[PDB]
Ligand binder design. Structure first.
Ligand SMILES: *N1=[C]C2=C([C]=[C]1)[C]=C(O[C])C(C1=[C][N]C3=C1[C]=C(C1=[C]C(C(=O)N([C])[C]C#[C])=[C]N=[C]1)[C]=N3)=[C]2
Length: 269
């Protein structure tokens, strides 16, 4: 903990990131290293202090090439900082929508899915869940490096279930049926969300279930409606989506199985 602690005056704030989408996140400069960093701050009513401080504590334990790396914290005295590495190309959703598809082609998409599934395999092993897997929550660096934002991770042992607080509102079109109906989350609900993320990647950032009313999504899902295969999407990639969208959570593949399948497809391309 104290090994991560640093003075606030080691950081200079340059630009506010967002805009507002992720809260109070700023582009910053770690002066002694001339290093651009991302700085999370706590305002008046952004989030509760103890939650903010727990986010910093959890990230200290997280180390993976495809998870946003913690660099330091300022947790001795307010204003509290959380300092992480900076991903120059922003979120994956806007990246896919605005990219050159001749550069970001089929093999690059597989490479992206491989990286993300690698991070989720890690979280799966370390008994963590993400609970908001989506393109908007993945970050892109140079050479199609993709990292998953890990600022809302929850501790949960394999086979256990997290029950979301009462009155919680979910990103419905990314949300597993057991979560929509009973506020229950597990690594298998992350698997479901990963399937939607795959669909986002295959469509270069199109909105899921296009035109479909949010109020009828759950009802469609229980009658085994699923999104059709996007064009250009390899059948085996789509079969991985459909596997992620099995009704029964235990029927869904593990992230270890998902990552292995993508690693094979990526290497054999
Ligand atoms: N606490 C810390 C966070 C977040 C929530 C709570 C969310 C984040 O983004 C998902 C970060 C974060 C860490 N590294 C990082 C982060 C966000 C960006 C980013 C940059 C840009 C961008 O390039 N703009 C606006 C133009 C310029 C300059 C767009 N979106 C996201 C990059 N790296 C930390």
């Amino acid at each position: 903990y104290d090994k991560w602690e640093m003075e606030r005056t080691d950081i200079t704030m340059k630009h506010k990131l967002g805009g507002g989408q992720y809260g109070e996140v700023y582009e910053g400069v770690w002066k002694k290293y001339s290093l651009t960093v991302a700085v999370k701050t706590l305002k008046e009513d952004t989030m509760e202090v103890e939650e903010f401080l727990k986010e910093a504590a959890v990230m200290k334990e997280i180390k993976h090439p495809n998870l946003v790396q913690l660099l330091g914290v300022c947790t001795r005295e307010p204003p509290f900082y959380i300092i992480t590495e900076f991903m120059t190309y922003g979120n994956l959703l806007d990246y896919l929508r605005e990219c050159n598809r001749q550069e970001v082609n089929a093999v690059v998409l597989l490479y992206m899915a491989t990286q993300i599934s690698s991070a989720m395999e890690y979280l799966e092993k370390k008994n963590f869940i993400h609970r908001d897997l989506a393109a908007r929550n993945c970050l892109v660096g140079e050479n199609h490096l993709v990292k998953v934002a890990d600022f809302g991770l929850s501790r949960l042992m394999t086979g256990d279930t997290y029950t979301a607080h009462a009155g919680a509102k979910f990103p419905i079109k990314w949300t597993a049926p057991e979560s929509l109906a009973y506020n229950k989350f597990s690594i298998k609900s992350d698997v479901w969300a990963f399937g939607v993320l795959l669909w986002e990647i295959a469509t270069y950032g199109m909105s899921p279930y296009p035109g479909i009313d949010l109020s009828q999504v759950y009802e469609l899902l229980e009658k085994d409606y699923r999104m059709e295969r996007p064009e250009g999407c390899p059948e085996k990639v789509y079969e991985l989506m459909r596997a992620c969208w099995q009704w029964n959570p235990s029927d869904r593949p593990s992230f270890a199985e998902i990552h292995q399948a993508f690693e094979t497809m990526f290497q054999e391309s």
